[PDB]
C-alpha cells in the first residue's frame, strides 16, 4: 500500500523550480517533506529503500555518534594534527538528500543546524576565525514519531511532534500514517507479508514493468530536461491561494489547525507544479500539474480527520 507516499517520493526526486528569478532573488528546487505516523508503519524501511535508490542520499537517526553534524569529517584527522576543517558544514549537504529518522530525538545543536540549512541558506558557524561556509542546498526528508506513540482524539497541533511551529511551517508537505484497525486492509497486509516470507524472494505477486537501474536512469533523464515555467498558470494559482486563504478564514474552527496562512504554501504549490512539469512533458507547465499538486496537498491534509 501507501501509493500517495510513493507519488510524493517521485515528486521529491525530480526537484522543484530553481535557477533563481530576476533581481537575483533566491529560490530553491529542493522540497521539504516530513513523514509522520505511528510506530510499526515501516516508514523507516521506505526511507531506507529511498536511500538505496538515490545516489546522493544520506541517512541519519537519533544519536549514536557526535560527528554527524556541525563538524567536518577531517577534524583532527591528519597524523600531524593540522586542524583541517571547514567550519559550519553538514554531510554532503550540496545537492544531497538528508534522510532523518526520529526527528524528535536529536539535541539542540542538530536542531539549530537543521534550522540553519533552511531554504538553501548556507552554514556560517565559526569557531576559530574560519568562515568558509558550505553551500547548503539539499532536500529534507525526515520521519518522526508522536510523543505518545499513537494518534490522539484531541487536537493535533498541541499534540504535534514537540517541534517549533516555524519549522513545521517551513516544510512543503506534511503527511500522516495513522494505523486504522480494520479487516479488509490487515488481511491484505498479512497476506502480502506471509507470501513474501514463503518465497524467500520478491514474489511474482508484484507487477512492476520498471526496475531500480531503470528508475536511476530515468530520474536523471527527467531532471536533465528541465522544463520552464508557463505564465498562464498565474491566475489559476492566485485564485487557488485565494481559496487557501479562505480556508485560513476557517482555521480558528480548530479540531485541526494546519490550515494556516503562509506564502510558503503558495511557494511549495508552485514548486510542486514545476516538479510535475519537470518529471515529463515538454518545456512548458501544464495546469493539470497545478491541479495534481493541489490534490496531493488535499490528500496530505485530509489524513488529520
Amino acid at each position: 500500500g501507501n501509493l500517495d507516499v510513493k507519488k510524493a517520493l517521485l515528486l521529491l526526486l525530480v526537484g522543484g523550480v530553481d535557477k533563481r528569478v530576476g533581481d537575483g532573488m533566491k529560490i530553491r528546487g529542493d522540497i521539504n517533506v516530513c513523514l509522520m505516523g505511528d510506530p510499526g508503519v515501516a516508514k523507516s524501511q521506505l526511507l531506507k529503500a529511498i536511500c538505496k535508490i538515490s545516489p546522493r542520499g544520506v541517512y541519519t537517526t537519533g544519536k549514536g555518534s557526535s560527528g554527524v553534524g556541525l563538524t567536518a569529517a577531517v577534524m583532527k584527522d591528519p597524523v600531524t594534527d593540522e586542524m583541517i576543517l571547514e567550519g559550519g558544514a553538514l554531510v554532503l549537504a550540496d545537492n544531497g538528500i538528508c534522510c532523518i529518522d526520529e526527528f524528535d530525538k536529536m539535541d539542540e545543536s542538530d536542531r539549530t543546524a537543521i534550522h540553519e540549512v533552511m531554504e538553501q541558506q548556507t552554514i556560517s558557524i565559526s569557531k576559530a576565525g574560519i568562515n568558509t561556509t558550505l553551500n547548503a542546498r539539499t532536500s529534507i526528508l525526515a520521519a518522526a514519531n508522536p510523543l505518545y506513540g499513537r494518534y490522539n482524539p484531541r487536537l493535533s497541533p498541541l499534540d504535534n511532534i514537540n517541534l517549533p511551529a516555524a519549522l513545521l511551517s517551513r516544510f512543503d508537505i506534511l503527511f500522516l500514517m495513522l494505523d486504522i484497525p480494520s479487516r479488509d486492509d490487515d488481511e491484505k497486509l498479512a497476506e502480502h507479508v506471509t507470501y513474501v516470507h514463503m518465497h524467500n524472494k520478491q514474489p511474482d505477486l508484484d507487477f512492476t514493468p520498471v526496475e531500480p537501474s531503470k528508475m536511476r536512469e530515468y530520474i536523471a533523464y527527467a531532471k536533465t530536461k528541465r522544463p520552464v515555467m508557463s505564465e498562464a498558470v498565474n491566475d489559476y494559482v492566485v485564485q487557488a491561494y485565494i481559496r487557501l486563504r479562505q480556508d485560513s478564514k476557517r482555521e480558528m474552527d480548530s479540531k485541526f489547525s494546519f490550515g494556516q496562512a503562509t506564502p510558503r504554501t503558495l511557494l511549495g504549490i508552485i514548486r510542486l507544479s514545476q516538479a510535475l512539469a519537470k518529471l515529463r512533458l515538454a518545456d512548458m507547465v501544464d495546469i493539470d500539474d497545478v491541479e495534481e499538486a493541489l490534490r496531493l496537498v488535499r490528500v496530505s491534509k485530509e489524513s488529520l480527520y
Binding site: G40, R183, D186
Partner: protein, 337 residues
Amino acid sequence: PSIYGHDHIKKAILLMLMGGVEKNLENGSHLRGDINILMVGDPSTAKSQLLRFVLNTASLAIATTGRGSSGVGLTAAVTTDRETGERRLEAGAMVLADRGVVCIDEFDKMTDVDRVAIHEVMEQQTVTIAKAGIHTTLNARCSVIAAANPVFGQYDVNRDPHQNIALPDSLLSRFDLLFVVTDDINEIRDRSISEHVLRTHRYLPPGYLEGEPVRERLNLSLAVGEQAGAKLAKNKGNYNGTEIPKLVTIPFLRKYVQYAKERVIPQLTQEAINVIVKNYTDLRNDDNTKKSPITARTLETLIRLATAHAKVRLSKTVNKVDAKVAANLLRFALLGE
C-alpha cells in the same frame, strides 16, 4: 526444577534458546531471526534466579547489570596496545556474545543514555564506531533477556500498563514477548510453594555428610581428556522418582539443543500461513482491552515462533500445530489465559 509454576515462562525460554532462522534477501536486506523476552513484575517472584539458570544452561552467555555498566564501555573501547603503541578497538560486552544471549538485570535502573545504544543493536543488530580516526561496523546478532521492576514498589493492576513501566514504548515494542508476574495471595498456593521450598532446603550433596560445610575441591585428574545403545545410562534422564512424567538431565538437553541448532533448517507451508493470518486478523479486530497494542510486527513473531517450534520437534516443515501453539502462547502472554 527448583522453581515452582511459571510453566509458560519455561516454554518461552526453551523456544528462545533455539530461535528461528535469519532471512537475507538481495533486495530485502536482512530480517531479524531470534526472539527477545522482557520480564516485569512484583518483587521476590524468582526472576533473577531464572535468569541465572538461563546463564548456566545456555552455551554462550554474558551477564550485565543496569547500574554496573556504561553504554560507551558496553560496545567498544579505544585503547592502545602496549607493544605497538597503536590504539585499537577493544571488544565490548555484547559484541563478545555475538550469536549468543545477553542477560540484563535491573534493566529499568539503567541510565537513559545507554538505553539508546540498546535500541541501535535492537534495530539492525549492528554497532558502528566512528571516533579518533576509526570508522568500522561491528556485527552483533545476540538476543537479550532482561527483567525490570515496576515504577512503584508493586505492580498496580488497575492502572495503565504504560503507567506502570518506566521505559519508552519505542524500545518496548521491539521486544517480542512481555510477561507480567504477580504473587496472588492464596493460602493453597502458599502451602504448595511452602512445601516445595522446604523440600529444596533439605538437600545434601551425594557422598558427603551433613555436619560440615561445603569445601573447595581439586581439578580433574587428567589435564587433557577426550556397548552403545544398550545401557541408556543418562539417556532417559530420570535420575530419581518423584512424578510419573519423565525428566531429562541438563547435558542431554544441551546436546539436543546443539543438534537442533545445526542439523535442521525448517521451512513454513501454506496451512500454517492460513492459521497465522486468521489469528492475526481476529486479534487485530477483537477490540477489547489488552496489555499492549498490536501491530504488523507481531506476525513476524508468530512466524518465528512457529519456526522455533518446528525446530523443537525436528521437522523440516512447519505444520499447523505449531501455528496453534504459537497463537495460544501469544494469547496467554498478552491477553492472559
